[PDB]
Structure formats: structure tokens, C-alpha cells
Amino acid sequence: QIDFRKKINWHRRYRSPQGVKTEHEILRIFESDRGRIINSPAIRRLQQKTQVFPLERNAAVRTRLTHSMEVQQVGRYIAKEILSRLKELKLLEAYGLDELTGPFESIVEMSCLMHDIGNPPFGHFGEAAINDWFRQRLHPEDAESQPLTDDRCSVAALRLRDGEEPLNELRRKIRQDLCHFEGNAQGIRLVHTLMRMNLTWAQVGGILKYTRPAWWRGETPETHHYLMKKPGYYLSEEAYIARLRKELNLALYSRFPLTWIMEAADDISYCVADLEDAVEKRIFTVEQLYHHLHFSLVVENAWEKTEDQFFMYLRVNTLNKLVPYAAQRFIDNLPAIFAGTFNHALLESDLLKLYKNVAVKHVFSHPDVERLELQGYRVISGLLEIYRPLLSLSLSDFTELVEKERVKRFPIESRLFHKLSTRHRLAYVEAVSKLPSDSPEFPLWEYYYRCRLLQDYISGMTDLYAWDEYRRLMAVE
Amino acid sequence: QIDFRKKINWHRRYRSPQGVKTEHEILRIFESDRGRIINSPAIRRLQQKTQVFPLERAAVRTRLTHSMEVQQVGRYIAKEILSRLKELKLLEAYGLDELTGPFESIVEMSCLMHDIGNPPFGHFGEAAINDWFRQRLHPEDAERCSVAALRLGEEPLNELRRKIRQDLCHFEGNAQGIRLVHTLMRMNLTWAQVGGILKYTRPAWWRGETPETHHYLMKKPGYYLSEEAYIARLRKELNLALYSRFPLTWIMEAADDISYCVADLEDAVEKRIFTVEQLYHHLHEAWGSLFSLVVENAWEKSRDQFFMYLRVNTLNKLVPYAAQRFIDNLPAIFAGTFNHALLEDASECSDLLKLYKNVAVKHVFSHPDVERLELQGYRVISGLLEIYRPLLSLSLSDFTELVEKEKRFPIESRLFHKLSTRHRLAYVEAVSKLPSDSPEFPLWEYYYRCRLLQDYISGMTDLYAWDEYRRLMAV
Ligand SMILES: Nc1nc2c(ncn2[C@@H]2O[C@H](COP(=O)(O)OP(=O)(O)OP(=O)(O)O)[C@@H](O)[C@H]2O)c(=O)[nH]1
Ligand SMILES: Nc1nc2c(ncn2[C@@H]2O[C@H](COP(=O)(O)OP(=O)(O)OP(=O)(O)O)[C@@H](O)[C@H]2O)c(=O)[nH]1
Ligand SMILES: [Mn+2]
Ligand SMILES: [Mn+2]
């Protein structure tokens, strides 16, 4: 049976609120989360990360922040609709939402704002660059089978030792997980291990969009084929997610009920924003666009009601038709959505597919846009190659470097090690300290956390900072 | 007597929603406003406009990130006012039982839009505009003016000259915000939403000494001579007395007062002007009291942890105080006549903020880098104005000819085209309305032509204004 008291969990991991709390008391807990997220540097960093078009000095353009802000509005509208409908259906009290009314819309809003928090500089091409670079170091293709003699993996510790070990399973997991960087998973890593935000279990649940472990090697089960689409969390966060699952009464590979809303909100916001920016950047006129789109109720109607006015009314019409649909879909499939087992999105739609198609054919295909995707990949690929010496080091050597911060045998490695943000470096120390040194899997775990350290640093950079750092360290600035 | 149904007005200026509406129907009206504002280019432009420190390559606050943080304080205050009103059983009594959401939504959007009308280099962009216009049409004399039409034998027409001369030298971001949401952006927001962004009630053209009764509300200019008619309708629509403020503005104001410096001290430590320790010391220098309760308490938890707990403590003391102040003075606040802020001087609470202001003034705003940017900004805007001076130099017939057939004026034409269509349209729209036969027609035209230029400049982002200066300087 459906009881949102069981899902909207107002407890925290560390220094947790306990006891019996008033409707107001619980409200203030969730309002504290809002403050944490809004005043977070991780969120301020988004105004420097780019959405589609590069950041200009004529930049009426959207950034990851302005877009995330617009998604937050869609999410609010959807949640507000789900609740207004549930109230009309007299189900609000029946589902336990009568007192958790505000936290419900607040969780959705903050999950929307945070939905792009772990994306790396250059987005899909920053992801590409990281995975491709790590793939060429520790070949995960080789670990799927039995320990091969020509194991291409360069990391001596991570090479599969010849029919000898179940320790080989850790190697498989480490090799695959490190080649499966995903912004979604990095977001969980970031909110927990890195930013140490200490959000409520319910708030963290909302940003777990996928349930596939990064290290996953097989083909996802038919039952959860959709929820396991992309990796949702890393091998480092395995334990955290395992508690989150317990705290939110989630089955294995089940999603948090509210995530379907943030997802739907994201689906609506996807292109419409970027077509508005394409007209601004002058790729085409509002007229030219109306032609490529060429349904009557949304697009034609908005054209009749010039530049800002068309998009203001395209957005309105789109929302006024899609928001109620998503809200209805959610209520209609609430049993499965509640269990976290529902294997579809709220909009599984043709109107959105139309916007996607026009944007793909005439905006994401633009030479300027495709030349930043090429450049971005070069930058991140370069950056990784610059810090390669840290991963090249032996455990004893790297350990020595972490201990007496400045080492004389390694001048370059020391200097590069200091470049890494203290927040990430701390997380390494903290994680590696927890492991038992005597353990045979200790060197395997250390290398994993050392790689994770580097991935954390790079993904943590803003688009511009990564570009600068590349040019500075290339000795061209 | 206090009935928020009368103040939370969900009607629009153009193609207005009409009739009897469900709680849900009214909700969707106010949610449409949110969408309009959030997806507005005027709001996206804020991430390019600077709050204190220059825009670097990143963790620093821009006008947008700050406005976003104010929005949170405003939400917290409004949410408190409503939780308290509910406990007092007054929610139904004040008509707020159904307008519960629009109440917190109006506060939130008025917070995001406080700063929207601010020109490129803030108080220095304001400075540059007013000083430039002051040296053209001397308003001191109307209580030297180069504009032949605007120079004062006799005439009551002279009163328009006085109004035009003072109004043009009294550019204010707050007033520009009203101009921008109405005439320029043409956002078609609800009357209630517009009410929330009218922070001051003084007409820009005002020359006298503000009446003692409204001395505070008339602190700075709240609206221009061009928006006179608009405000007159807004006043009617929101049942506001002359020079009275919208009830909810006191909340956005209080939210703004709290957010003021704390943000910038956090950024000063980031930019490495001082250490958290150095800061704790200067705060001590400036003063079991509120001080121990907020600052000392936050330092103990830490020795980001310091600022996280400074913010929390500050808010947990100030938010309920503001909420209480608002409920306590609700009759006057509702009438719009209340002549104080929610956190006014006397209070120990106000003194905590004054402390943050003092530390930031002495060690942050006084920073050479900060001051360099201020000097530079003034130079840019001053320069930019001087670049477009030829448009204001033109005779009415000549300028009119230019607006019509978009040859004798190559430079003026080209400069006229540089002006954003949105502002140029607003000029045409405004000047078209005026009766040509009228003797005050040339006076009105010049006013709108000047307003056109002020709109263009203030409309620029910090960076765009800097670029445009260097481009037009042929560098
Ligand atoms: N430059 C560029 N941008 C794109 C392209 N396709 C989509 N986008 C934009 O980039 C984003 C890509 O969306 P997703 O792939 O869903 O990104 P995401 O939501 O973080 O990924 P998921 O969370 O896994 O869905 C969208 O928000 C679009 O604005 C493309 O081919 N090129
Ligand atoms: N660079 C700089 N920034 C300052 C200084 N004093 C204040 N600020 C910043 O400017 C912001 C706004 O200051 P105000 O001009 O008083 O307020 P406002 O938001 O423009 O609105 P009103 O007071 O209603 O006109 C503060 O929150 C600070 O971030 C200063 O001397 N230099
Ligand atoms: Mn997105
Ligand atoms: Mn301010």
C-alpha cells in the first residue's frame, strides 16, 4: 500500500534529526536542505558551465544554471499539479501526503536544480574524454572473460591474475567502474563524499535518476531495463546507496518515487530553451523555425500571438498541455512508481520529439556547436594526460607523496598533486584511511580511489577553468 | 479590514484573466508569472552583471546568484509569516487561506526581480548616467541647461521642463525595473506581481522635501515620469493610496537587508582578502548577547562550516523577527502607509546586520580591485553616453526623419541602429501616443529620446557595455 510517510524521509546521514516532529518541524528540515543547495558553490559553478552554445560576452544565452533554474520551475508545476489532482481525488490523506505536502514539492524542486550538478566540463564530450582516456589505460573489455595472458590493462595491480583469485572480481568492478564515469553518479558522489552537504535521505533519493551500478558488466534485466539505462552510482558510493535504499524502503535497483517527476520536468525543458537561444544567436529567424517545426494547439497558436513573445507562448502552451499529462501519468501509475519498479518515464510525447528533431537537425548540428564539442574533448583529454604521472606512481611512492606533501625525488608529481583541490584530496585520504592495509585488495582499492581522485578534480572544473588550466599547463599562457 | 483578496490581484494589464476562479485556477495564473520571469532574458542577463567582485573564471556571486539567495530568504520570511498567522488563526480572517501559495510566490519573484533594473556598473553605472545627464540639462536651475526646448519669460509649460529635467537626472535601478517589466520586456505580469517590485514610491521628478508621513517610502525614486500613468493604474488595481507601498514589498525588502553583506564576506575569504580567523577578529572589533549567540556560536562550530553556521544563526534570529514585525504592524503594512522597514535601526537584530555592513565596508568594498572596477565602470558608461550624444544633439525634425526612413546623417543613422529594437519600439510607441499639435510635444519627445538612450545603456550587461565601449572606441 501507498504511504509517502515511508518515502519522504527527513533524517540525515550524519548528526541526524531524531524523534517526533510537527508538520512545521519537518518543513524546516526540508527548508534547511534548500538553503544548503542554493548557497552551494557546486550550484554557483553551474553559471560557468555551458548548456549548448559557448559562453559569450553577448551572453543572453543559457548556462547549466539558468537551464537548471527553468527545469526547477517545470518540476514545481508538475509536483503542484500531482498534489492538486490527489486532493481532488481525496487520496492526499490516504497516501500520507497530507502533512508532507511541502517537502513533496521542495524535494522535486531541489532534485531539479541538482540534476546537472555532477556533469563534467564539456558535458557529453567531457564524459566521452574521461571514459575514453581511462579505457585506454585499464582496458575493461579484457576483464569480462577469464584472466587473459595479453591483458591490455596497463595498471599492474588491476591485471587479472591467472585463474588464481576471486580478488579478480574486484579488478573487474574497478576496471569497469572507472571507465563508466556518468554525471548522474558523480552527482551522488559529489553530494555525499565531496561537498559533504548532509542532505535528507529523501533529498538524496530524488537525485538518484538511474539504478545501474557503474561497474555493471552484463545486460540489465528486462524488469528494470529502463531504470538501469545509464550508471546511477559508483563502486565508492556502493555502501551509501545501500543505506539510502534501506532508509527510503527501496528494493534493489528501484528508483525513488519523486525522481519520475524531476525526470519528466527535464524531458519537457530539454530543447525548447535551445531553439530560443538559436534564434538569439541568429542561426535562424522565428519564421524559419516555425517552418522546420511544420500541434496546431501548441505551435500554430503561439505563432499567432515577436521573438520573445513567440517563445513565451510556445513554452506556456507546451507546459499547459504536458504538465497535466505528466501529473496524471504519475497518479495513474502510482503503485509501480511508489514501489520504484515502474519501467517507463512519465512521458513515453510526440510534441517534445518534434522539438528534439528540429534542434538536432538545425542547432546541435551547427558548426560552432560541433567545434566546441571537438575542442572540449581535446581539452579534457589533454588535462588527463597532464595528470597521468600521479597515476603512474607506485603505491609506496604515491603514499609517500600524500604523507610528506612535498617529495624531492618527484618534483613534477608533487607540484601536480598540489594542483588537486583539497576537497578531493581529503576524500582520498579519508577513503584510503578506512581500508585495512594488511588486506590483499588494499592496493586495488587505493588505485581505484586515486583514479577517482583525478576524475573528481576534472569533472569538478568549470568549462572555462578546464580550458584555461589546459592552456596554462601546456605552457601557452 | 485586512483582506489579502483585495491586494493579491491575479489580473493582467493586457488580455487579462477574468471572472471567478478556483484556488487552483488562481494558482496556475501565478505559476505562469514564475515561468515568464524565470525564462526571461532580463533574468538570464543577471549572470553577466556583477555583485561586488569582478567576474572571474568562478565560485563568486553574480547579480543572479545573489538574487537567487535573496529569493530563498524571502521564501523563508513569507513561509514564517504564514505559519505564524496560521497558529494565530488569522489566516482565514485575512483572506490568505486560498492565496497562500501566491503570497509566497509573489515574495519569491519580487526577490529574484529586485536588481533587474540595475545598470551595468551598479551604483557607478547610476552615477555615470545621472552625472552625464546633469551636465547636459542642469536640474539645479529649474527649482545652464543645454537643451533649448527644456530651458525655462513665463509658462505653466515650465513645470513640464522642471519634471523632465529632474526625472532624467534621477535614474534609479528600482524605477528602471518598473519601466523594464512594463514598457520594455512587455512581460504582462499580474498586478500583484508588479506591486511587489515597486520598493519606493517617490516619483523620479520629485524636487521637494518628501512628506514626514512617507519620508521612508519615498527614500529613493521608485518610478519615472513615463511610468506615471502605469503606476496610477497599479495603485487603482492594488487599492494603494498615493505614495503607498504594496504589503508584500516589506518582506522582499527585509530579505534583501539580510542578504546584503554576509554573501560578500564569504566571497572575500574565497578571493583571499582575509582568512575566516581574520574576519572573526574584525567582527569582534566592530562590537551572552545576539552577537555571542550568532557570530561566536558559528565560530565555535567551525574551529565553509563557519559561513554555513553564520548564515543559519543569522537567519534563525532575523527571519522570525521580520515575520513578527510584519504581523505586528500588519494594519499599516496592509494600508501601505507604514513608514519603517521590518528591521529598523533601534533593534539588536538590525545592529547584527550593521556589523556585517561595517566589516564589509572597512575590508571588502574598500578593496583596490573592487574600487578599480568602480572607476573603470564609470569611465565605460560615461564614454558610452558620449558616443551616443549625437542622437540627442539632433533636432526634432531630423531625429523624427531618422526614425521614419531608418543620408545626411551617416553616423547618427548607424548609431540609431545599434539601439535594441525593444527600446526603439518603446520610443515610437510612446511618441506616437502624444498629440503633435501640442506645444509640450517637443518637450515630451526629447524626454522619450533621452529615456530611449538610458534604457539601452542600463539594459547592457557589465561585459557587453565594456566590449561596446572598446569596439566603438575603434580599439
Ligand atoms: N551540444 C549538444 N547538446 C545537446 C545534444 N543533445 C542534447 N543536448 C543538450 O544537452 C543535454 C543532453 O541531455 P541528456 O543527454 O539528457 O543529459 P542528462 O539529462 O544529464 O543525461 P540523463 O540525465 O542521462 O538523461 C540536453 O539538456 C540538451 O540541452 C547535442 O547533440 N549537442
Ligand atoms: N562594489 C561595491 N559593492 C557594494 C558596496 N556597498 C554595497 N555593495 C554591494 O551592493 C549591493 C547592493 O547595495 P545597495 O545599493 O544599497 O542596494 P540595492 O539592491 O541596489 O537596492 P536599493 O538600496 O533599494 O537601491 C550589496 O548587497 C553589496 O553586495 C560598495 O561600496 N562597493
Ligand atoms: Mn538537462
Ligand atoms: Mn542587493
UniProtKB/Swiss-Prot annotation, chain B:
Q: Does the keyword Magnesium feature in the UniProt annotation? A: yes
The top EC class is hydrolase
- Give one Pfam family, short name only: HD
Q: Name one GO molecular function term.
A: cobalt ion binding
List UniProt keywords, sorted A-Z: Hydrolase, Magnesium
User: InterPro entries this protein is in?
Assistant: dGTP_triP_hydro_central_sf (IPR023293), dGTPase (IPR006261), dGTPase-like (IPR050135), dNTPase_1 (IPR020779), HD/PDEase_dom (IPR003607), HD_domain (IPR006674)
**Any one biological process term the GO annotation gives:** nucleobase-containing small molecule interconversion
Database matches in HAMAP family: dGTPase_type1 (MF_00030)
> In its UniProt entry, what is this protein called?
Deoxyguanosinetriphosphate triphosphohydrolase
